[PDB]
Amino acid sequence: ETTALVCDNGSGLVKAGFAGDDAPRAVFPSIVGRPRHQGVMVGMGQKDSYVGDEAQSKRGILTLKYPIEHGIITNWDDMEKIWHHTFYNELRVAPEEHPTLLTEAPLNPKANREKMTQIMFETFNVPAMYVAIQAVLSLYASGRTTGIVLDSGDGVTHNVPIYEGYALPHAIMRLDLAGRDLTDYLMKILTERGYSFVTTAEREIVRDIKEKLCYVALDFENEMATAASSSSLEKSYELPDGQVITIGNERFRCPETLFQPSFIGMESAGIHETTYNSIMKCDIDIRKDLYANNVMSGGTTMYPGIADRMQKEITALAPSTMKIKIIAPPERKYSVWIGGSILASLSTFQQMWITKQEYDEAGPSIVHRKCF
Amino acid sequence: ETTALVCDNGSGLVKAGFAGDDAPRAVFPSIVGRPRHQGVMVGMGQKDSYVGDEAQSKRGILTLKYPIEHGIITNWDDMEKIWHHTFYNELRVAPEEHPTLLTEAPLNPKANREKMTQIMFETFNVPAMYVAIQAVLSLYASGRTTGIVLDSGDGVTHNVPIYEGYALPHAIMRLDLAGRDLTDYLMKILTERGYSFVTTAEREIVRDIKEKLCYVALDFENEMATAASSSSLEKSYELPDGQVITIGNERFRCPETLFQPSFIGMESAGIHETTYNSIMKCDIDIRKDLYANNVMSGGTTMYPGIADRMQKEITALAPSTMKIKIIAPPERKYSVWIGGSILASLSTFQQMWITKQEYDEAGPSIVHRKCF
Amino acid sequence: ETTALVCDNGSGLVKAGFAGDDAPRAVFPSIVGRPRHQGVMVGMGQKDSYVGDEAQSKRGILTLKYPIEHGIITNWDDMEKIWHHTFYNELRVAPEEHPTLLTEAPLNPKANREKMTQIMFETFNVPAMYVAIQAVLSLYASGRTTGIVLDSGDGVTHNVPIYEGYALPHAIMRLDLAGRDLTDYLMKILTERGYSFVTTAEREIVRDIKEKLCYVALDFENEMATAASSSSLEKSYELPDGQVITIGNERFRCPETLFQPSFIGMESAGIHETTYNSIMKCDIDIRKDLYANNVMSGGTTMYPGIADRMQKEITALAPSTMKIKIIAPPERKYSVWIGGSILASLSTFQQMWITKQEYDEAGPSIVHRKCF
Amino acid sequence: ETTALVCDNGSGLVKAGFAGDDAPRAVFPSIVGRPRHQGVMVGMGQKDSYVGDEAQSKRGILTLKYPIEHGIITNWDDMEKIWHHTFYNELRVAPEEHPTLLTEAPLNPKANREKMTQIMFETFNVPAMYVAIQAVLSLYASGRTTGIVLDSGDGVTHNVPIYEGYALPHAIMRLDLAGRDLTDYLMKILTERGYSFVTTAEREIVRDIKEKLCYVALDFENEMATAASSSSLEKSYELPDGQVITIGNERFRCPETLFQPSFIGMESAGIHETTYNSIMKCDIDIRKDLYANNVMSGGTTMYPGIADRMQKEITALAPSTMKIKIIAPPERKYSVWIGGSILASLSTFQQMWITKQEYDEAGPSIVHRKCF
Ligand SMILES: Nc1ncnc2c1ncn2[C@@H]1O[C@H](COP(=O)(O)OP(=O)(O)O)[C@@H](O)[C@H]1O
Ligand SMILES: Nc1ncnc2c1ncn2[C@@H]1O[C@H](COP(=O)(O)OP(=O)(O)O)[C@@H](O)[C@H]1O
Ligand SMILES: Nc1ncnc2c1ncn2[C@@H]1O[C@H](COP(=O)(O)OP(=O)(O)O)[C@@H](O)[C@H]1O
Ligand SMILES: Nc1ncnc2c1ncn2[C@@H]1O[C@H](COP(=O)(O)OP(=O)(O)O)[C@@H](O)[C@H]1O
Ligand SMILES: [Mg+2]
């Protein structure tokens, strides 16, 4: 075998590439868009469905939608369409040759992982596959074997405590507040400035406002008082039509929802308390090593100042006699893919694949008894 | 204090009156018209601006325009002109004596509510005021404390779920499809019969066609097939010049845009799905009480058959094991004013006013921290 | 004196009534809920705190929380609120007249029993009180004087061996696995069917699923193989919104955690081995009489088939030459209250109260030297 | 022959080294831990069993257990695992060259000493071995030939009276109260402060609390009255997670169980009365020399104040006309190993080994007729 495929199917992006590389070749949005207008011109290649960067370019005339909602694939007719675009049109490989490392989030529905396995052996007919867990692979990329992993992407936020090779699956927290629920809260609080964004085409604009103007305030109630003297805080953003918006305290009110989830009306705790409550469910001996290894990964951890508020606010929860260290890489947007590239290239791993022969005598239920 | 003013400034009508009454004294259109022709005759009281029923009478020589567009006041020089006509020329009161209850739509720009507050204390110098929310006051008029309120007037349609005294502001939907966008769609589909209505003076005629000939079809695709045998469906309307029009399937194609907003080219859901999606954002315990209380209010809910298609089509979305009850009063055109008359006459309410003394030490920013 | 109060303050329910009765008058959940939403409606009796059945009815808009966690009262400001609701609003008595029999679990913190005693004499000013032990009072209700008592409620599971009037306090086992940790495990394994229950309001729904669909499998590995042919095992449950769920092998996987506590990640033994290890800490002469008297009590012993797996699996641990008899009443949900009604009505008991005069000259430390 | 091995296999520690040295090279806990969690990471040396200091370091994810319970080896599959770790991984010797001096407690099962002898000649194939008695070797280390030896380690407490070279085996007392039953009583009485320690990983923490905060009160009923004025007695201890505990009268209530064994429910006498009853079973002539030589050894005699309560309370039992002298060394934690180093280096001893040739013609029953 030449090499293996590492296809991180996130809720918002599809990271894909080959095992043993340092960056994914394929990074494109996980969108399938259908046209919603008339279609008067004849010829000129009017397809019925646009996937990824085509749907992101032609988005003004498309009804964009995501097949993956909060980590759960809900639109298997359209998720097969993204995988077909990934392997053939974006990596340009034959899936019948390469084994495919897939990822998903922990505490997930069991029918999700089975239906992935049924598609990869029947529709694509791969030789082998394996469904890993995203917070495990975030810890291969940091090279460490001990640490609680705050992985937060577009669909779901989850803590997985891992001591020296051994996960503690009774302490895995999962929180369905992620980047896509911050986009929906940012559309709600940009309305009070008088900027109505309604369609899914502007949902991809408010996301782009968030990725380059929103930061995390270290103290929320002081920055709110600083925003009353509204001079040194308002930045401008140029919309694709040409209009400019002046966004003020909404620069820090939407990432505060990570830390105060009651803004979007959730009876749950922030990402700083579901990390502390996930350590206080672990054994008392390993709590010293989990405080000193707080690996953050995923795109929702990419805000400015989020590693300096996690460290500021777990410290107020932890006992003061020991140190807290949030590990913030510069590549943690891709670290679920990086660790999958490491794990799929190991020599010890190559007996852990679910092969096609092993699939035929057990069906899709083989994936529970061999992965996790 | 004798009594308080309840001034429902809708996008299309100005309902105004006193607290504790059963009907508003002042109901007139929210139009400010300027003359656009020469003006040859000398004397005879040629004013420069006509407000309300004067502009509705002299509308053939006026450029009519609305200051309130989709709930947002955009023409503060002309909105002060309507309020001056309301208090002095139509209610005939002194605004320096009475406190004034104002209403607006939820999810609105914050500069809208501030600039209302700045005008009422500086230009009119009222003793006190309060800016309520229209879907809240629709629920005082029905006497209930629990229910999702489909309020749809001339400017905006919005659902507000309210459980037992407590609103759920993360589930407030707002949709900018209302009666004024149905008038614009009715002018577009009356063109295909060969009746061109172009100016704003005929915009007030097509609205009058809609208010007495348009109904909601219970099944759209059967009534469209019934319209192919075009005998039992075409009604006639006598225009002010004397001409008659024969309107057929346009009797039900324009209120279908409430339920299929793609007719006017909107990537959004109808009023039956933004009610179901606003209940499915609420907590799972209160969904049983919101299905049984669907309070409709505002003028765009006054079509024949709209309570029998909301109940018909939420039932196809809801699980079948429980009942849906659309509450359709006969007075729901005025129920935002009726509930404001109730709320301004309560004895528990009379400490919730923003007074003139309280305004002077906080400016116009007092209205966010005391109303909503 | 007319009669005495028997207030069984469990972790999940508050059983309360009078001495000498056959059933408690007051049975309501031990919940104090605070509202978490806005509160827009004016008047209509919006309290700040809801206790018991009010918080269980209005639970969709409340942050429900329990003051008693694993038998330990942690929220003395809110535990006084439940007792105030019990005596005044639910029994409708004057606490200044009646003596109050209280219960708690063995091996408990000493500051818990003192702070109960300090409240009942200062805040309520009862004439007398007494803090019993729950597994002792479970044995008055069965009428027996000899037997090991497996008491398992919502907060804690504990074995207390009692030979002929004499407890063996060196063999009292206490295990913090109870009904509330089975609710948390049932929410975790209903996620893999795709039913996310997140807030505390759905925590009261998953508990209601458990109380009427979960049973104890007599052999776990055969019922797991029966669940692979998933036809004769899946029952349905109708949620309050109207949705139905199809629960399969989760009907028996959550009460298996009583017998295999490693499912929720506990290095401890099941309820069948902590009964056998609590008998093998007793003297060798009384082990014959403790095998023949296994009194079960509390609500977590109410599953179908739990008396037939305790008897099946202690028999595999005990030597085969003698018989094991699990005593399963039909009233063992209330038997801690029933035995407290018996003990508070005895004529020999009425010199064992801690009186108000005796409290004033020793402080709250009188309760250790007189109760246990 | 170069030298001989002296392997003191205690119930809690494994002291091992060479004959003729002043301290054992190998001192590590006698624990074999198995992992109990999932094991998600691939590679990185996940063994199946951890012995000694590895299991003491990784103890948060291990089910720790002791193979030696009250002096009796119960887990011969895991006791061979500790000996394999001792000789190869911790002393780094070849057992085929060195003769091995082993120790055990008196009044022990005969199958224990045989199965030690069968392993050392078959599994390890030593040239010679000898199973001594621990209280005999405690008296070589003090250099004396006369004295009753109170040896108390982790598993068992035993008195052995020895007059001038001659033991009195009818007066050997053996008591199964030792350091491991004080750890279990300390976990029971730390619960009443509200510090629940449940797993075996916290059993190794409560032991570490006991080894540096617990002392022996000279008068128990006065220190109990001093603890009522709880200021000058409470010391603090920093747990590995970072939490601090405030331990008060539990500093002296757990070593009082050595002197009042009814605290853990034992119908037996303390270590001061089983020394007096072991002298009053000796002949009346040698009772004068046994009062003046009370050699204490083992780790449970290392508490502060235990030599000053033994001398205080045997004096109340002995007739007052003669003096009592408790011999408390500073090295009595290791004195069973020190005396074994002395005895294995003597020239008179080197004909008392059980050799491999002598083993082959008598089987494992040779050890009764040659050792004791
Ligand atoms: N530079 C950035 N700053 C803040 N947020 C970002 C940034 N880049 C991406 N995001 C957010 O992170 C999400 C994508 O994160 P990612 O971990 O790639 O998602 P997934 O793993 O689900 O594909 C997007 O929703 C986006 O809103
Ligand atoms: N009888 C009617 N039938 C149908 N539509 C009506 C009727 N009366 C008014 N409307 C529509 O409702 C709108 C006015 O409703 P109203 O609730 O008064 O608006 P607002 O609350 O903004 O004043 C107008 O656009 C009109 O087209
Ligand atoms: N019929 C039932 N079947 C199974 N479990 C039950 C049943 N009724 C109650 N439970 C469980 O028992 C607990 C309550 O038991 P109870 O003895 O009332 O506790 P407490 O003594 O703390 O009041 C609840 O957590 C509930 O989950
Ligand atoms: N410094 C100390 N103070 C009090 N107790 C101790 C101390 N050191 C060890 N112990 C107790 O003594 C036991 C170890 O004694 P030791 O003689 O080493 O046992 P063994 O002979 O079985 O190895 C441990 O269980 C510990 O609880
Ligand atoms: Mg991801």
Ligand SMILES: [Mg+2]
């Ligand atoms: Mg209105």
Ligand SMILES: [Mg+2]
């Ligand atoms: Mg109870």
Ligand SMILES: [Mg+2]
């Ligand atoms: Mg020893």
